[PDB]
Amino acid sequence: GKGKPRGLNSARKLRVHRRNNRWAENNYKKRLLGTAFKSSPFGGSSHAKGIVLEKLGIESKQPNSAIRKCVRVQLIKNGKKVTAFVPNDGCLNFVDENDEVLLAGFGRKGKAKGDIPGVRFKVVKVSGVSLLALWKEKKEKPRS
Amino acid sequence: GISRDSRHKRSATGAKRAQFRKKRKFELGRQPANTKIGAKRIHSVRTRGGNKKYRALRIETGNFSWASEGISKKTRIAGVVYHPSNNELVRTNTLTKAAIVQIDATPFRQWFEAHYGQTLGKKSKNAERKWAARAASAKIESSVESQFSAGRLYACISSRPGQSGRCDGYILEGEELAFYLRRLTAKK
C-alpha cells in the first residue's frame, strides 16, 4: 500500500501530510520564518556600505597564509560588525579607518576563501569610486 | 454616528471581526423620535433622495377609524393604557406604533345619535327609513357600549409617528378587545 492513503476522499490527509513534511526541507523553514530578516546582517539585501572599523586580526579558519589586509567593518544601515575582504590584495595604503566600502558575497554567501573568521564579503566600491578601475592604476587601492 | 452596519457584530461562530473601513453616511441611524402628547411641533427631516420624513414628536390629534362600521373621524386621545414592548412607556404616556389608547367618543356618538336612531349613551318621511329600515343592523356589541358611558373608547394605533408624522388609531373590538382587556385588567 506504499505507506500512504490513496482513496478519493483522503486529500484532507495529504495536503495536511505534506504540510508537516515541508518543514523537514531546509530552505522552506529558513524562508517562512523570516530568518533572513531576523538575522543575516545584509537583512535580505544584496549589498551594503559601511565604515571600515580597523585592520583585522587573523583567526585561522583555513588557509590563505598571510595577514590578509582585511578590514573590520561595521555597516550603517544596521551597524552589525562583519569582517570583510579585498581582492587584488596588498596595497595597504590608500584609505583611513571609518571609511566607506560596498560589500558583496564571494559566491556561497562566502563563508570560506581564506584563514579569517567570518570573511565572506568582497568589497566592491570604496567611497563611491570603484576597485576595478582602481586596480587598473587610474586611482589607488585602499588601506583599512 | 449610529451606524446600522453588520460588521461591528460578532459572527455566529463567536469570532470577533477585525476592523474594516471607517464608518459611512449611507448606512446611518438617527435618534428615536420618542413621540408624545399635548401640542404639535412636527420636525421634518431630510433623507436620502430629498424624500423628507416627518417626525411627530408632540402629536395631539389624529384620524382614528372604527373598522366594523367604516367611518373615520378626527379625534383626540386621553393617553395610553398599555404598551406591548416596554412598560416604561405607559408612565411616559408614549405613543408609538401599536400602543393602546383611550380616545374621545364625541365624534363617534355625535355621528351615532344623528345616523342610527338608536341614540345610545344617555328629517322627513324618507329619512325615518334611515332609522327604521336597519332591522338587525343597529346592534353594537355590549362591551363596545360600556365605553360610551365613560365617553372614552379603547383603540390601538397603526401609524408610525416617528416616520410619517401621523397617528391613525383603530378602535379595538371583539376578539382582540377581549384579549387586550384580559391583559389590560392585568396591566393597567
Place this chain on the structure above:
Amino acid sequence: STELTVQSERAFQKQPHIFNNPKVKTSKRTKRWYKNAGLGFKTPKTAIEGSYIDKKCPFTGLVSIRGKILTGTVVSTKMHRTIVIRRAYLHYIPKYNRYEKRHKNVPVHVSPAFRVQVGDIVTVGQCRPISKTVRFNVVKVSAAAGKANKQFAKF
C-alpha cells in the same frame, strides 16, 4: 408551550389587516388568509385549518420564496420555531485529484405547520433576511422514517 389561542406574547398575534367581522355573525366563522408558496408547493393542511399566526411562515405570513432552495438533514431543534440543517459535500483539490468531506450549518426558520425531528430531511427556500443567520424558511418536510407506528407488532 404556545397554547393555541396563540396570544401568549404581550401582543395579539393576528394576520395583519385581516379583519374578523364582529357586527355580522354568520356561517363564515373562519377568516384565515393564506397564500400559495409558489414553485409547485403543496400547502400544508395545518395552514389552511390552523389558529397559529407565524409572521414568517411562507404560507400564512409576510415572507416570500426566491432564488435558492436547499436540501439537507435536521439537527438541533432546541430553538423555537427554527431548525438548523447541515449540508455535506465534497470539496475538491487538484493537487491530488481528490475530494474532501465538508459540511455547512444553515440556520433556517421552521413553520408551526410542519412538525419535525432531529434527523429528518428538509427542503428550504431563500427568503428576505429574518435574523442575522437566517435567510431561509422551511417549506417541505420529506420525513423518511420508515413507518414504525405498529412495525414492532411484527410476524
Place this chain on the structure above:
Amino acid sequence: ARGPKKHLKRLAAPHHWLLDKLSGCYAPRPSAGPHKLRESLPLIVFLRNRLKYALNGREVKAILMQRHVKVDGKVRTDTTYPAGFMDVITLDATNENFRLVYDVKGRFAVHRITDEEASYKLGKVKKVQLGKKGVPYVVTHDGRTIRYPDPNIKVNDTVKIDLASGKITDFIKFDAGKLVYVTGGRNLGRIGTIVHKERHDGGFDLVHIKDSLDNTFVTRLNNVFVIGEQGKPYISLPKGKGIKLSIAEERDRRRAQQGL
C-alpha cells in the same frame, strides 16, 4: 466610491467600439439616456472614426453645434449621446441616412437606408403595466412609455413605433416561426426563427433558436428580440443578413472568393 463615474479609461471601453490601443489615454464615456452604458456607441464613435466625416473632436462638435445630424427624428447635439441599438440616424448632409443594427461580430457598422423605414423605429416591449387612473401602458426597450396599447399585447413582444409622434401601429406576437434577433450575450447579431421556450420558474427562460443554415443556439430570453415571421423582417437588414459564417469560411470568402 463617492457617487458616480465620469471618465471611462481606454481599454475599459467595450470591445465593440474597436478603439485603437494607442493614440490617447481615455474613451468618450457615453452619457445617460435611451440605452445601456455597455452597448451605447455614442455619437463621436460613430462620426469621426467609422464614417470619417470629422478628423478629431473639435471638428465633431463643429457638426454637432451646427444642427446637422439627427438621431430618431430629433436634433440631438451632444458628443457622448448613446445612440444605441435600432436607432435611425438621419443626416442633414448630402442626405445619406443610416440605421444602427449590428453585424454578426456584435459590432455596429455603417448601414445606409431608404425613407420608407427611416420614418419609424421598433422596440421590445420590456413591460406592459397598468399605471395611473387605471391606464394601461407599455415600456419598450429604449425609454419610451406609450399609453393605451392593445390589451392583447403582453411582455416580450415588439412594436412598430413611429418617429414623428410615438404611435404604435402594429405588433408581433411570441411563438415559433418568428424571425428573431439577439441583443446581448454571445450570439449577438444572430437571426433565425425561434424553436421553443423554456419556462424555469424563478430562473432564466432561455430559448432554443435556429438560423438560416439550421444551426441552433440557446440564448437567454432577456436577449431574444422577435421581429418577424418565416422570412419577414420589418427593416432592411445589412449585407450578409446576420448569419454567422465561421472563421474558416471568412478565409474562404475574404481569401478564396475575393482572393483568386
Place this chain on the structure above:
Amino acid sequence: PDKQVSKLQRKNKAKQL
C-alpha cells in the same frame, strides 16, 4: 523566564529605533 520574543507585530513598536 520565558524566552518569548515572538508576536512581533510590535516589531513596529521597534520603529522606536
Place this chain on the structure above:
RNA sequence: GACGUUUUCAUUAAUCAAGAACGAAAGUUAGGGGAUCGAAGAUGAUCAGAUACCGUCGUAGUCUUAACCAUAAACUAUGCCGA
C-alpha cells in the same frame, strides 16, 4: 489455538487520530521471610601502568503481598489484514 461438522448471525468487517489494558531487567512506597549470592561499600590486596584482572564480608536487591514505572540490541534490527 488447531481440527471435524449439510448447526446459528447474514456483512455483524480491516487497520487505526483521540481513548484504554498490559509490561522484562532495573528503579519507585507500605509489609513477610531474611536461605542464596551480591551494583555500592568496609577490608586484605599487591608490585611502578608483566596488568590491575584478585580475594573476602556485604546494607538494600534477588523471592513474594496491596500498587506503580512504562525503559531495551522490547531485535526475526522487517506495522497489520490480501495473491
Place this chain on the structure above:
RNA sequence: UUUCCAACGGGGCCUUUCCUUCUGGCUAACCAGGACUUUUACUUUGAAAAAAUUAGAGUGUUCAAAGCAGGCGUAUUGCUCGAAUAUAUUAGCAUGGAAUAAUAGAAUAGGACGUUUGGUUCUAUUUUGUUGGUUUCUAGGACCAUCGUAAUGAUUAAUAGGGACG
C-alpha cells in the same frame, strides 16, 4: 454516378427486451393533460465567464520589436479590404448519459396490478332562475367491513467474521 462480394454505425420493430398509461386537434406524426422502469456522488453538451496579457491569419512599420493597420487606377474630383478565434476547473444554472459508489422498497404484505363494492373528508365549473341561508346525483384524491389480481415479498451462506456442540 448503373453498381456483385464483405466490413465499420445507430434507429423503426421483433424472438416475456414495458418501448406505458392520456385523449380534443386524429382517425400518437406531434402539441395541453395523471405516474416515471427511486434520490445524491460522476460525466457529457450549452451559458456565464470585462478589456489589457498568452496562441494566429493578413498588413514590405524598409525586415522587425511594434501596429491594427490599410490597398487600387482614367487620380477625370474617386473606388475600396478590415480591425478573427482558441482559452479560463470547483461553486452556481440547464438535460441526457445508464456503469461506478451510494440509498433500499414488498416480511405486517397495516403494499402493489384493485379496471371492486357498502360507508368517512368531500363537493359547485355547474345546470339550478338573476345574486347569497336548504340540498343531491356528482368531476378528483385516501382507508376500515371486504374479497375478486398476475407470475403476490425472504439476491447468497464467503478459501470474511461472531455463536453452539463435539
Place this chain on the structure above:
RNA sequence: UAGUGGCCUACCAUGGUUUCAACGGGUAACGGGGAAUAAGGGUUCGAUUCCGGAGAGGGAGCCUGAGAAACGGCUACCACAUC
C-alpha cells in the same frame, strides 16, 4: 433606515461553532488576469498602465448636496510645524 435584519431596544427561550478543525496567533498579506517556468503536473511572486477595495499624518464628526463620514471641503482631538 432609502429599506431586510439583533441593526438596536423591552420581555422571553438556552442556544450557536468545532478534531469535517472552531476559537486564538503570525503574515516582510490589498485582493483578481501577469511573471519565471517550459515533457506534463508542481513551484514562487503579483506595489505597479485594467477591474474592485481602502486612505489623504492617525482616530473621530458634521454641513452643502441626487450623491461624501470628502480632506487642492469644514469642526474638534492627537503628532507635527511656518511668519
Place this chain on the structure above:
RNA sequence: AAACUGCGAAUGGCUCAUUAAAUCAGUUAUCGUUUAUUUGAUAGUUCCUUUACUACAUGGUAUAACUGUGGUAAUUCUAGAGC
C-alpha cells in the same frame, strides 16, 4: 469687467499602511431599497369655495457687484452707510 444665480468642484491623479469568511472572484436576489442627470410619457379641478380681502395688462419685498468713508502685524479678513 465685476457681481448675483445655476451647474461643476463626489470625476481624474497618487499610494498599498490596515484587512485572513474580511476584501475579492464567479454566481445570485431585492415580492426589502434610494437614484441629480439623460430619454419617454405625464396636471382644464391653482381664488380649496374656483359664493373672491384679487393683480393676472403680470402683485411684493431683500441684496451683491456699482459706489463712497475704513481699520488689520499679516489671510482670498472684512465694517459703516447710500444704490
